[PDB]
Amino acid sequence: ANMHQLLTELVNRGGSDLHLTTNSPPQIRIDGKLLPLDMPPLNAVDTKQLCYSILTEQQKHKFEENNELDLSFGIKGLSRFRGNVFVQRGAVAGVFRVIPYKILSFEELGLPPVVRELAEKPRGLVLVTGPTGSGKSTTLAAIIDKINTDRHEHIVTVEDPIEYLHPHKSCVVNQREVGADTKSFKNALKYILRQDPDVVLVGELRDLETIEAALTLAETGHLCFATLHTNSAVQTINRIVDVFPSYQQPQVRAQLSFVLEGVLSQTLLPKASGTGRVLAIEVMVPNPAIRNLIREDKIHQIYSQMQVGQEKFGMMTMNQCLYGLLQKRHITMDVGMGRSPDPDELKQM
Amino acid sequence: NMHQLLTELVNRGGSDLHLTTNSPPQIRIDGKLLPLDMPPLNAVDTKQLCYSILTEQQKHKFEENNELDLSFGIKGLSRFRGNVFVQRGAVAGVFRVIPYKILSFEELGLPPVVRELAEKPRGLVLVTGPTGSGKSTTLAAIIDKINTDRHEHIVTVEDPIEYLHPHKSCVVNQREVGADTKSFKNALKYILRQDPDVVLVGELRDLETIEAALTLAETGHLCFATLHTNSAVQTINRIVDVFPSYQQPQVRAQLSFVLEGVLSQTLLPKASGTGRVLAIEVMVPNPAIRNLIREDKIHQIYSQMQVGQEKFGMMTMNQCLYGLLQKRHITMDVGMGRSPDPDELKQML
Amino acid sequence: NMHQLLTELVNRGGSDLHLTTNSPPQIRIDGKLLPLDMPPLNAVDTKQLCYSILTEQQKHKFEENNELDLSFGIKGLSRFRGNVFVQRGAVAGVFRVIPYKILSFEELGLPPVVRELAEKPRGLVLVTGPTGSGKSTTLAAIIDKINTDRHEHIVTVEDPIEYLHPHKSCVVNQREVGADTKSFKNALKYILRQDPDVVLVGELRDLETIEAALTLAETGHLCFATLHTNSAVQTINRIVDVFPSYQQPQVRAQLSFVLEGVLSQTLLPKASGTGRVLAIEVMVPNPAIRNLIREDKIHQIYSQMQVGQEKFGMMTMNQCLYGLLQKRHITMDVGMGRSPDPDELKQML
């Protein structure tokens, strides 16, 4: 009840976040700065009643079981939201972020066409990496929107939690939220190969059964998208190899050499304008030479390939991104240099 | 009703029916989805239809797990395997057809050498390729020919059952994983005490199953197994490279002795826009290839295949695409888009 | 009675009250125990007093476990945290004071540069030293200044709560381990979905907490954390040397990028015999230090600090002891006793 009015005020004011906590009125983030609403301060009873008013009994029992809860929900004709609810100093608290219904396109994010071209493969493993809140969901949503528009294939999503809704355009899209639609990632992966899928967005690679699921899916003729937490292609490769036991790293390396179609390592940086974030990206797309370097156990030489893979594979170094951000004046020169993983390379350029 | 949906699916030769909310029913024909001229279904529709083919205990199970596998029949039409799940708080369903009638070898476009392989007394024969590339169809053709011509013992273990074989002249026992046997491991642990001649093992999912199949192949039994590669070399590399480096010599020796045929398939759309056509690579070891195995020269086995056309009946993918091009079954672009080396296929043209 | 014991404890500015059999009550003042002029308590005394501040359920818990943590208030005086336990078959108790008033930066003897650090928008700041060396007091001063001057989001996670912050202009949510959240791991797994600007993570107990703090530090958030070293070099060596050798270069780059301040404190007794005084080492990276990180020369960063007094506001421990000696706050022997290089301090004198 009150939550609906509070959220209406949030939308009407162009706000990003709603905060519910004891002994303070609700506060909304406007242009980066917090502003309290003209309401009495909340107590533990208030945050409790507001947060419980939009949850089912299963969600309530989960939260009461863990004193933590991640969730998403929509208000029809208004907007969708991603929420995180927690407990502090013995009282209920809630935070709610706005997740737009309309997905921005690839060109709006400033990503070159080769990233879009890697997304147009029939099968294999494509990884988009970077830390949390680095734009991963936005690229993934643009992709699964392009695929929904352009292909006649079966897209299934497993999400923790569901973030973007994809109404049916020409594909059939089934989206499973862990903790509501399905018991766990393990159960979904146990049954997804008998629901005739072609494309899968799997979320975080939280355990071995899911990594194994990604290799089997990519090997059984599907296009698998997954996320990681790393800042560069080489660091990404090291991450991929090093998670497996040492005796089993050879097979996974062979598998990866077969199924890998693209690795993207992104990062969102604050914009100089004070609104939005700007992309710095290292892109590795395997060619026959890189696949041989993997097969030949010459893992060092990948650095040489990124230095020499601009024309062949479209691999763009960090310094070229700093050049472009500097010419358009979106970021300053010092932070860009301060962010380069190898300033001596930037010096050489 | 559901009977009408499945009859339309059957009549149009579709493999899979997809039922989900806010979209009309969609069916996969030749790999591509097509919606039926009906209003979109809602959660009530999918729920009522899927529950209409569930027992009360199966409905209890499904509501307990949000997953359910089952099979059912439509009289005078066909049987169907259904999978029901939940997405966005609503019922969803996928239904896969199980054909009763196996097409013959010549109907599948397979050369006569496969028929001579059905008369082989022992060894290991591999049918590989991505999902829906005709592997199961090839096995069903082999099983039906063997069942008809020989008086031997066929045992199949499948997860799930794809083709049913009433007894014709052999005794055929078919075990379903998750009901008939706990796992591949228990069936393979006990299969050698069932007086077998022919064994179907399902997917080569791990090392244990490979070891069971290798033992079968050396002691005079016929074992069929699958992989998930697109070429002969990828198959050989996958099997060898899964073992530690110190044990690969023995495995290479085993493979050199027991291998009698390797089939890797791919299903391509037809130029007419209706139906799909089989492209298949066949590797039959000759002394040169067996030496290449002993010499650790896997990158050169393809070269022996380049010259094994007249002697062993081999045929590269480019040669098959060439024949499909001369017969105008596929376009040049699709063949090049699938050629692992488009320049070789260009040169042979 | 107990009320009198806690009021005398507060009035004398003590930190802890110790109650155990066959000794009078003893209070820690400036780190040293003083017994009160009362007869020694027996096991009946400690039992009755500790049980007098326990609920019946809490008495059941304590009798079940021989351990009990709790907090309670004495009206018009102070709040207290109690721990009750058992030794030689008898009740024992320890009682801590949790002050409501935070002293200011100037009252703590901290130079003005710390105030400018409370205005920093991002980076990683470390407050280190042994237990009770002023680390928590420094954090409370920082949080109070930030709460007063900024409109941002502060989240603290503590085991246990040390300072309570009513909302002043920020929203501050404080999570108690063992009640509000199961562990550091769950809070850090979910903290990035609460729209934070400022996060307090407690002790850097393991690798996973370091990884959470490093991710926070590079994505634009303010993270404060602690360690347990007595100098800047020991802090850098402890953070870098925890990772395997192959991952230490990237980590060194991360630290070189996100670090904005390192605070290593130590509390010394005063020459007057009443009160304690803060000695603090401040490391703010300059280009020379960042290069030293890049060049794997940790043993030479101290030398850069030896020459960074005028430029960056740095100050060695010996220089602080020198100032305290000039101000006659401490004796020469104590300073030499705490100097990591007494010869250097003598030389600068």
Coordinates of N, CA and C in Angstrom, one line a residue, chain C residues 18-159:
Chain C
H18 N 36.6 -7.0 35.5 CA 36.9 -8.4 35.6 C 36.3 -8.8 36.9
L19 N 35.5 -9.9 36.9 CA 34.9 -10.5 38.1 C 35.2 -11.9 38.1
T20 N 35.9 -12.4 39.2 CA 36.3 -13.8 39.3 C 36.5 -14.1 40.8
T21 N 36.4 -15.4 41.1 CA 36.4 -15.8 42.5 C 37.8 -15.6 43.1
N22 N 37.8 -15.4 44.4 CA 39.0 -15.3 45.3 C 39.8 -14.0 45.0
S23 N 39.4 -13.1 44.2 CA 40.0 -11.8 44.0 C 38.9 -10.8 44.1
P24 N 39.3 -9.6 44.5 CA 38.4 -8.4 44.4 C 38.1 -8.1 42.9
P25 N 37.1 -7.4 42.6 CA 36.9 -6.9 41.2 C 38.1 -6.1 40.8
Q26 N 38.5 -6.3 39.5 CA 39.7 -5.6 39.0 C 39.2 -4.9 37.7
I27 N 39.7 -3.6 37.5 CA 39.4 -2.8 36.4 C 40.6 -2.5 35.6
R28 N 40.5 -2.6 34.3 CA 41.6 -2.2 33.4 C 41.5 -0.7 33.1
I29 N 42.5 0.0 33.5 CA 42.6 1.5 33.3 C 43.9 1.7 32.5
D30 N 43.8 2.3 31.3 CA 44.9 2.6 30.5 C 45.8 1.3 30.3
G31 N 45.1 0.2 30.2 CA 45.7 -1.1 29.9 C 46.1 -1.9 31.1
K32 N 46.1 -1.3 32.3 CA 46.6 -2.0 33.5 C 45.5 -2.2 34.5
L33 N 45.6 -3.4 35.2 CA 44.5 -3.8 36.1 C 44.7 -3.1 37.5
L34 N 43.6 -2.6 38.1 CA 43.6 -2.1 39.4 C 42.5 -2.8 40.2
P35 N 42.8 -3.5 41.3 CA 41.8 -4.0 42.1 C 41.1 -3.0 43.0
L36 N 39.8 -3.1 43.1 CA 39.0 -2.2 44.0 C 39.1 -2.7 45.5
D37 N 39.0 -1.7 46.4 CA 39.1 -1.9 47.8 C 37.8 -2.5 48.4
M38 N 37.6 -3.8 48.1 CA 36.4 -4.6 48.4 C 36.9 -5.9 48.8
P39 N 36.2 -6.7 49.5 CA 36.6 -8.1 49.8 C 36.5 -8.9 48.5
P40 N 37.3 -10.0 48.4 CA 37.2 -10.8 47.2 C 35.9 -11.5 47.1
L41 N 35.5 -11.7 45.8 CA 34.2 -12.4 45.5 C 34.5 -13.9 45.5
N42 N 33.5 -14.6 45.9 CA 33.4 -16.1 45.7 C 32.5 -16.4 44.6
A43 N 32.4 -17.7 44.3 CA 31.7 -18.2 43.2 C 30.2 -17.9 43.3
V44 N 29.6 -17.9 44.5 CA 28.3 -17.5 44.7 C 28.1 -16.0 44.3
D45 N 29.1 -15.2 44.6 CA 28.9 -13.7 44.2 C 28.9 -13.6 42.7
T46 N 29.8 -14.2 42.0 CA 29.9 -14.0 40.6 C 28.7 -14.6 39.9
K47 N 28.2 -15.8 40.5 CA 27.0 -16.4 39.9 C 25.8 -15.5 40.0
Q48 N 25.6 -15.0 41.2 CA 24.4 -14.2 41.4 C 24.4 -12.9 40.6
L49 N 25.6 -12.2 40.6 CA 25.7 -11.0 39.8 C 25.5 -11.2 38.3
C50 N 26.2 -12.2 37.8 CA 26.0 -12.5 36.3 C 24.6 -13.0 36.0
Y51 N 24.1 -13.9 36.8 CA 22.7 -14.3 36.5 C 21.7 -13.2 36.7
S52 N 22.0 -12.2 37.4 CA 21.1 -11.1 37.7 C 20.8 -10.2 36.4
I53 N 21.7 -10.3 35.4 CA 21.6 -9.6 34.2 C 21.3 -10.5 33.0
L54 N 20.9 -11.7 33.3 CA 20.6 -12.7 32.2 C 19.1 -13.0 32.2
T55 N 18.6 -13.2 31.1 CA 17.2 -13.8 31.0 C 17.3 -15.2 31.4
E56 N 16.1 -15.8 31.8 CA 16.0 -17.2 32.1 C 16.5 -18.1 31.0
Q57 N 16.0 -17.7 29.8 CA 16.5 -18.5 28.6 C 18.0 -18.3 28.5
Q58 N 18.6 -17.1 28.8 CA 20.0 -16.9 28.7 C 20.7 -17.7 29.8
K59 N 20.1 -17.8 31.0 CA 20.7 -18.7 32.0 C 20.7 -20.1 31.5
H60 N 19.7 -20.6 30.9 CA 19.6 -21.9 30.3 C 20.7 -22.1 29.3
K61 N 20.9 -21.1 28.4 CA 21.9 -21.2 27.4 C 23.3 -21.3 28.0
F62 N 23.5 -20.4 29.0 CA 24.9 -20.4 29.6 C 25.1 -21.7 30.3
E63 N 24.1 -22.3 31.0 CA 24.3 -23.5 31.7 C 24.4 -24.7 30.7
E64 N 23.9 -24.5 29.5 CA 24.1 -25.5 28.4 C 25.5 -25.5 27.8
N65 N 26.1 -24.3 27.8 CA 27.3 -24.1 27.0 C 28.5 -23.6 27.8
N66 N 28.3 -23.2 29.0 CA 29.4 -22.6 29.8 C 30.0 -21.3 29.1
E67 N 29.3 -20.7 28.2 CA 29.6 -19.5 27.6 C 28.4 -18.7 27.4
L68 N 28.5 -17.3 27.4 CA 27.4 -16.5 27.1 C 27.9 -15.1 26.8
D69 N 27.5 -14.6 25.6 CA 27.7 -13.2 25.3 C 26.4 -12.5 25.4
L70 N 26.4 -11.2 25.9 CA 25.2 -10.5 26.0 C 25.5 -9.0 26.1
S71 N 24.5 -8.1 26.0 CA 24.7 -6.7 26.3 C 23.5 -6.3 27.2
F72 N 23.7 -5.2 27.9 CA 22.7 -4.7 28.8 C 23.1 -3.2 29.1
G73 N 22.1 -2.5 29.6 CA 22.3 -1.1 29.9 C 22.1 -0.8 31.4
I74 N 22.8 0.3 31.8 CA 22.6 0.9 33.2 C 22.1 2.3 32.9
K75 N 20.8 2.5 33.3 CA 20.2 3.8 33.0 C 20.9 5.0 33.6
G76 N 21.0 6.0 32.8 CA 21.7 7.2 33.2 C 23.2 7.1 33.2
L77 N 23.8 6.0 32.9 CA 25.2 5.7 33.0 C 25.8 5.3 31.7
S78 N 25.5 4.1 31.2 CA 26.2 3.6 30.0 C 25.6 2.3 29.6
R79 N 25.9 1.9 28.4 CA 25.7 0.5 28.0 C 26.9 -0.3 28.3
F80 N 26.7 -1.7 28.3 CA 27.8 -2.6 28.6 C 27.6 -3.8 27.8
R81 N 28.7 -4.4 27.4 CA 28.7 -5.8 26.8 C 29.3 -6.7 27.8
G82 N 28.6 -7.8 28.1 CA 29.1 -8.8 29.1 C 29.4 -10.1 28.4
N83 N 30.4 -10.8 28.9 CA 30.7 -12.1 28.6 C 30.8 -12.9 30.0
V84 N 30.0 -14.0 30.1 CA 30.0 -14.8 31.2 C 30.6 -16.2 30.9
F85 N 31.4 -16.8 31.7 CA 31.9 -18.1 31.5 C 32.2 -18.8 32.8
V86 N 32.8 -19.9 32.8 CA 33.0 -20.8 33.9 C 34.5 -21.1 34.0
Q87 N 35.1 -21.1 35.2 CA 36.4 -21.5 35.5 C 36.5 -22.1 36.8
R88 N 37.1 -23.3 36.9 CA 37.1 -24.1 38.1 C 35.8 -24.3 38.8
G89 N 34.8 -24.6 38.0 CA 33.5 -24.9 38.6 C 32.8 -23.7 39.1
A90 N 33.2 -22.5 38.8 CA 32.6 -21.3 39.3 C 32.4 -20.3 38.2
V91 N 31.4 -19.4 38.5 CA 31.0 -18.3 37.5 C 32.1 -17.3 37.5
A92 N 32.4 -16.8 36.2 CA 33.2 -15.6 36.0 C 32.6 -14.7 35.0
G93 N 33.1 -13.5 35.0 CA 32.5 -12.5 34.1 C 33.5 -11.4 33.7
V94 N 33.3 -10.9 32.5 CA 34.0 -9.8 32.0 C 33.0 -8.8 31.4
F95 N 33.2 -7.5 31.6 CA 32.2 -6.5 31.2 C 33.0 -5.4 30.5
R96 N 32.6 -5.1 29.3 CA 33.1 -4.0 28.5 C 32.2 -2.8 28.4
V97 N 32.8 -1.6 28.3 CA 32.1 -0.3 28.1 C 32.0 -0.1 26.6
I98 N 30.9 0.4 26.1 CA 30.7 0.9 24.7 C 30.3 2.3 24.7
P99 N 31.3 3.3 24.5 CA 30.9 4.7 24.7 C 30.0 5.2 23.6
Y100 N 29.1 6.1 24.0 CA 28.2 6.8 23.1 C 28.9 7.9 22.4
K101 N 29.9 8.6 23.0 CA 30.6 9.7 22.5 C 31.9 9.4 21.8
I102 N 32.0 9.8 20.5 CA 33.2 9.6 19.8 C 34.1 10.9 19.9
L103 N 35.3 10.7 20.3 CA 36.2 11.9 20.3 C 36.5 12.3 18.9
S104 N 36.8 13.6 18.8 CA 37.1 14.2 17.5 C 38.6 13.8 17.0
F105 N 38.9 14.1 15.8 CA 40.2 13.8 15.2 C 41.3 14.5 16.0
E106 N 41.0 15.8 16.3 CA 42.0 16.6 17.1 C 42.2 16.0 18.5
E107 N 41.2 15.6 19.1 CA 41.3 15.0 20.4 C 42.1 13.7 20.4
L108 N 42.1 13.0 19.2 CA 42.8 11.8 19.1 C 44.3 12.0 18.8
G109 N 44.7 13.3 18.5 CA 46.1 13.6 18.1 C 46.4 13.3 16.7
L110 N 45.4 13.1 15.8 CA 45.6 12.8 14.4 C 45.8 14.0 13.6
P111 N 46.8 14.1 12.7 CA 47.0 15.3 11.9 C 45.9 15.6 10.9
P112 N 45.8 16.9 10.5 CA 44.7 17.3 9.6 C 44.5 16.4 8.3
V113 N 45.5 15.8 7.8 CA 45.4 15.0 6.6 C 44.3 13.9 6.7
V114 N 44.1 13.4 7.9 CA 43.1 12.4 8.1 C 41.7 13.0 7.8
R115 N 41.5 14.2 8.1 CA 40.2 14.9 7.8 C 40.0 15.0 6.3
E116 N 41.1 15.2 5.5 CA 40.9 15.3 4.1 C 40.6 13.9 3.6
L117 N 41.1 12.9 4.2 CA 40.8 11.5 3.8 C 39.3 11.2 4.0
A118 N 38.6 11.8 5.0 CA 37.2 11.6 5.2 C 36.4 12.3 4.0
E119 N 37.1 13.1 3.2 CA 36.4 13.7 2.1 C 36.7 13.0 0.8
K120 N 37.7 12.0 0.8 CA 38.0 11.2 -0.4 C 36.7 10.5 -0.9
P121 N 36.5 10.4 -2.3 CA 35.3 9.8 -2.8 C 35.5 8.3 -2.9
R122 N 36.7 7.8 -3.1 CA 37.0 6.4 -3.4 C 38.4 6.0 -3.0
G123 N 38.6 4.7 -2.9 CA 39.9 4.1 -2.7 C 39.8 3.2 -1.4
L124 N 40.9 2.6 -1.1 CA 41.1 1.7 0.0 C 42.0 2.3 1.1
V125 N 41.4 2.4 2.3 CA 42.1 2.9 3.5 C 42.1 1.8 4.5
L126 N 43.3 1.6 5.1 CA 43.6 0.5 6.1 C 43.9 1.2 7.4
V127 N 43.3 0.7 8.4 CA 43.6 1.2 9.8 C 44.0 -0.1 10.5
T128 N 45.3 -0.1 10.9 CA 45.9 -1.3 11.4 C 46.6 -1.1 12.8
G129 N 46.9 -2.2 13.4 CA 47.7 -2.1 14.7 C 47.1 -3.2 15.6
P130 N 47.8 -3.4 16.7 CA 47.3 -4.4 17.6 C 45.9 -4.0 18.3
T131 N 45.3 -5.0 19.0 CA 44.1 -4.7 19.7 C 44.2 -3.6 20.7
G132 N 43.3 -2.7 20.6 CA 43.2 -1.5 21.5 C 44.2 -0.5 21.3
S133 N 44.7 -0.3 20.0 CA 45.7 0.7 19.7 C 45.0 1.9 19.0
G134 N 43.7 2.0 19.2 CA 42.9 3.1 18.6 C 42.3 3.0 17.3
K135 N 42.3 1.7 16.7 CA 41.9 1.6 15.4 C 40.4 1.9 15.3
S136 N 39.6 1.3 16.2 CA 38.2 1.5 16.2 C 37.8 2.9 16.5
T137 N 38.6 3.6 17.3 CA 38.3 5.0 17.6 C 38.5 5.9 16.4
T138 N 39.6 5.6 15.6 CA 39.8 6.3 14.4 C 38.6 6.0 13.4
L139 N 38.2 4.8 13.3 CA 37.1 4.5 12.4 C 35.8 5.3 12.8
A140 N 35.5 5.3 14.1 CA 34.3 6.0 14.6 C 34.4 7.5 14.3
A141 N 35.6 8.1 14.4 CA 35.8 9.5 14.1 C 35.5 9.7 12.6
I142 N 36.1 8.8 11.7 CA 35.9 9.0 10.3 C 34.4 8.8 10.0
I143 N 33.7 7.8 10.5 CA 32.3 7.6 10.2 C 31.5 8.8 10.7
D144 N 31.8 9.4 11.8 CA 31.1 10.5 12.3 C 31.2 11.8 11.4
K145 N 32.5 12.0 10.9 CA 32.7 13.1 10.0 C 32.0 12.9 8.7
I146 N 32.1 11.7 8.1 CA 31.4 11.4 6.9 C 29.9 11.5 7.1
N147 N 29.3 10.9 8.2 CA 27.9 11.0 8.4 C 27.5 12.5 8.5
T148 N 28.3 13.3 9.1 CA 27.9 14.7 9.2 C 28.0 15.5 7.9
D149 N 29.0 15.2 7.0 CA 29.3 16.2 5.9 C 28.8 15.7 4.6
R150 N 28.5 14.4 4.4 CA 28.1 13.9 3.1 C 26.7 13.3 3.2
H151 N 26.1 13.2 2.1 CA 24.8 12.5 1.9 C 25.0 11.2 1.1
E152 N 25.6 10.2 1.8 CA 26.0 8.9 1.1 C 25.5 7.8 2.0
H153 N 25.8 6.5 1.6 CA 25.3 5.3 2.2 C 26.5 4.6 2.9
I154 N 26.4 4.5 4.2 CA 27.3 3.8 5.1 C 26.7 2.5 5.6
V155 N 27.5 1.4 5.3 CA 27.1 0.1 5.8 C 28.3 -0.5 6.7
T156 N 28.0 -0.9 7.9 CA 29.0 -1.5 8.7 C 28.6 -3.0 9.0
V157 N 29.6 -3.8 9.0 CA 29.4 -5.2 9.5 C 30.4 -5.5 10.6
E158 N 30.0 -5.9 11.8 CA 30.9 -5.9 13.0 C 30.6 -7.1 13.8
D159 N 31.6 -7.6 14.5 CA 31.6 -8.8 15.3 C 32.4 -8.6 16.5

